[PDB]
Design a protein around this ligand. Sequence first.
Ligand code: HEM
Ligand code: HEM
Ligand SMILES: Cc1cc(N)nc(-c2ccc(CNCCc3cccc(F)c3)cc2)c1
Ligand SMILES: Cc1cc(N)nc(-c2ccc(CNCCc3cccc(F)c3)cc2)c1
Ligand SMILES: C[C@H](O)[C@H](O)[C@H]1CNc2nc(N)[nH]c(=O)c2N1
Ligand SMILES: C[C@H](O)[C@H](O)[C@H]1CNc2nc(N)[nH]c(=O)c2N1
Ligand SMILES: [Zn+2]
Lengths: 410, 407
Amino acid sequence: RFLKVKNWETDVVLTDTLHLKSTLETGCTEHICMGSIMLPRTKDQLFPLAKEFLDQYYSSIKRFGSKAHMDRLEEVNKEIESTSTYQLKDTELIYGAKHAWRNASRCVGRIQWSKLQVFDARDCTTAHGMFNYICNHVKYATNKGNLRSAITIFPQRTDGKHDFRVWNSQLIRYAGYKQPDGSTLGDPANVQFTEICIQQGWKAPRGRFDVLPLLLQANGNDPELFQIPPELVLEVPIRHPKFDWFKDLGLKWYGLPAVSNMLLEIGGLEFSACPFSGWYMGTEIGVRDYCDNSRYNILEEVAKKMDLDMRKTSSLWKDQALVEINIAVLYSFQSDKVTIVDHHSATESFIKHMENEYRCRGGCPADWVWIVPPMSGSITPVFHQEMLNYRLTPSFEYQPDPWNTHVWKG
Amino acid sequence: RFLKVKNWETDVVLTDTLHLKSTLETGCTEHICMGSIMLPTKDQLFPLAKEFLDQYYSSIKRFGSKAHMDRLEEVNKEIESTSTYQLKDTELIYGAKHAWRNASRCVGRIQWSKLQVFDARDCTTAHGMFNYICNHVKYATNKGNLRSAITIFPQRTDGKHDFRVWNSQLIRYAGYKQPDGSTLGDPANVQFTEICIQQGWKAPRGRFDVLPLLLQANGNDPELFQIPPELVLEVPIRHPKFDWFKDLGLKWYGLPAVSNMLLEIGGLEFSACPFSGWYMGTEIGVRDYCDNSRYNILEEVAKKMDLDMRKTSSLWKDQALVEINIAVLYSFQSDKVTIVDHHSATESFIKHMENEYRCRGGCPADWVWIVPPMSGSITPVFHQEMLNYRLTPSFEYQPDPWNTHVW
Ligand code: HEM
Ligand code: HEM
Ligand SMILES: Cc1cc(N)nc(-c2ccc(CNCCc3cccc(F)c3)cc2)c1
Ligand SMILES: Cc1cc(N)nc(-c2ccc(CNCCc3cccc(F)c3)cc2)c1
Ligand SMILES: C[C@H](O)[C@H](O)[C@H]1CNc2nc(N)[nH]c(=O)c2N1
Ligand SMILES: C[C@H](O)[C@H](O)[C@H]1CNc2nc(N)[nH]c(=O)c2N1
Ligand SMILES: [Zn+2]
């Protein structure tokens, strides 16, 4: 089967065949679309998953059907039979992590997918060991502001009772503190996690931008607290190129976006701790982190200081302040030589990437709802681009927050 | 099978049961989501008629009544006899209002029960169509105090006698390809404009020429008619801060009136059903003015603003986009022509969704279309999960008539 997608700005039509390789389900049916819903192993099932992956790996290196390919299938089959699991070769792990990124339909940054530094941490055994690996990742990826994409991969799941987990949602994130008066100091997104850290013994500074400690679980054991060395945490004070009062808002953000709570699936194996990092698209900070009502919520204060007419929404004071904040974020990162991409550049690159994938790969699964930036949607080319969303493996998946599932040793 | 939608800004969860009544297909499967794709005999008719009258009689608290059964029987008798049936006025009004209620791509549905229905089923000629349409335009315009309206022409019979308005909207601007390869006016309308010229229209070849109506009655060849200029309310666009903005020479029309969709009620098909409301500002300011394939004015505006256009990261496009949208809203408000901003419209839609969940068990909504084309996440709908599904009565797309018409 062939499915076509059209771009309504350019009339370019693309043809998707890659969707034929999807196995996992979307949530939709012929009767309902769940496109805007945020969240819609015995040996038995494992060998087919391993075989499908190894077939893809061997095809990619142009060795499909070779003796090396056949011997590797045989080796994995026997390993599964006798140990109930198997270990990936370093080459397969690298290929697999790159492809999980390539396959991430919610990621606008995938033009970069083949440039990913993979740190193999499968020899790690303790939370202190994880801490060391994570510091090294942060220092490597940060590279004094010249950000480099990277992923660190801790040991895979065995019986599900010995999981490695980073309890942080991102490696670098700001604390949030609910006050007795119902207001929040710092990042309201992180209140629950901040409370857990405090309970575990963290001495909270109780400021507006306190970098959270790492809370690290090795081998199914109770998690342990570590402070990332402050000298490894690059931050950017936010100022505006024209508005000199902007700096006195006291805003800053960190340079390194590093997701630490997803699960990486390769060949049926599950890597429950696989922190990965890239660089920011400006709107992530300037639109969502700063301007969501449920986050730092700065629109009002910004608009006030700009002296916009705030008595009617139709003055578009919110839209005006939003643009100025996003200018400030890009200006500040660029002035400090910390890698960042604006939403125009990022989406234009994504379209070129998507066209290339259709041509070379037969498709590019993409989730329009997430790919379109949260401001200025239709002045970016992705708004006008039809997309097809489906699930390919290797993949990054959500997993339940570990405080909800962890069995405490005490 | 009972489904939850969450709002991620407010944590409010709603449960949807209405989707279980859904009839048509979405385009998606369990393997692939097509959420972002724009266009994804006698035997069929009685089940369709029944499903509709059932919901109608239920709505008036007379389900299972003598009058309900009598009506089912009468329509059944009529389909058996004539292979079609005629809706009572009450059913037609109910059906039109519900097609709007069911339109998953419409953010303005809080208004759904306030719709003036003009029954034009007695219309026989294209001149009669013209008269009905001028009356609709004048009623809906109401000197700038806009009122939602639909005019319903005769239903499809054998399909070779269709009523069609050939225009995509009752009021739209012409587009002309230039000798030098550029486009004057609205590029969206080039093909239709050529059909008008081919049919005889004398075009002024300007940037904002209101198109003539091309009206097809009873499957006959369509005819040209010009809407009395005095019935076409237009708004010159100026900015409350930038005095040079008026020098751009921009205007738009006050009345958004879709004329190329098909209304389906109880299996009957109304191929000419022009309907109108009032604009949300972004429709004009973001899409009509700033789409690359539309008037595409961003560059000229940015230049007049003296912005640094050398780098995307200056956000000059974004800055200019906001200023255009400020001017659109200011100009309509200053001339007392009803308009809604995207903040107000989306706030209203959330309230409407809440009403619908509470009173009806759901509200089909297409997120990709409901979220405004600028400032997405600062509107509440961005954070609102929506379920998309197709209920009837409905408005549907239909093929452009020129590809289908036998001359
Ligand atoms: C190189 C620069 C990159 C940029 C600019 C970028 C951009 C983004 C953005 C803006 C999002 C949406 C985040 C949100 O709204 O919550 C995202 C999602 C994602 N990206 Fe990237 N990305 C980059 C690199 C990476 C890398 C290195 C990986 C993994 C190896 C990755 C995998 C993902 C995944 C899995 C998601 C989905 C996250 C979720 O569902 O919460 N991306 N990307
Ligand atoms: C009262 C003021 C109204 C507002 C502010 C409003 C708002 C909108 C907007 C912004 C769109 C999207 C248009 C686009 O992006 O191309 C839309 C779509 C639509 N609305 Fe409305 N609406 C209104 C009244 C109505 C009425 C009276 C009807 C029918 C009786 C209607 C039925 C529809 C339908 C069927 C669509 C989908 C059109 C398509 O798919 O091309 N709406 N609405
Ligand atoms: C590697 C990378 C680069 C970049 N620019 N951004 C990201 C990134 C940032 C934040 C997030 C978090 N996304 C929200 C997660 C979430 C939260 C609540 C419900 C959901 F379904 C999902 C994911 C990826 C990751
Ligand atoms: C009654 C009403 C009020 C209002 N504020 N806006 C509208 C409205 C405006 C424009 C349109 C046209 N929609 C785009 C049609 C289209 C064009 C090309 C491909 C597609 F899938 C769809 C529909 C409804 C209609
Ligand atoms: C309900 C809705 O799906 C939700 O708010 C989504 C919309 N699009 C998004 N897009 C991105 N990139 N990130 C997000 O968190 C969201 N949130
Ligand atoms: C491809 C994509 O579905 C398309 O550009 C859509 C996106 N959302 C939209 N939303 C509205 N309201 N109107 C539109 O025309 C579109 N176009
Ligand atoms: Zn879908």
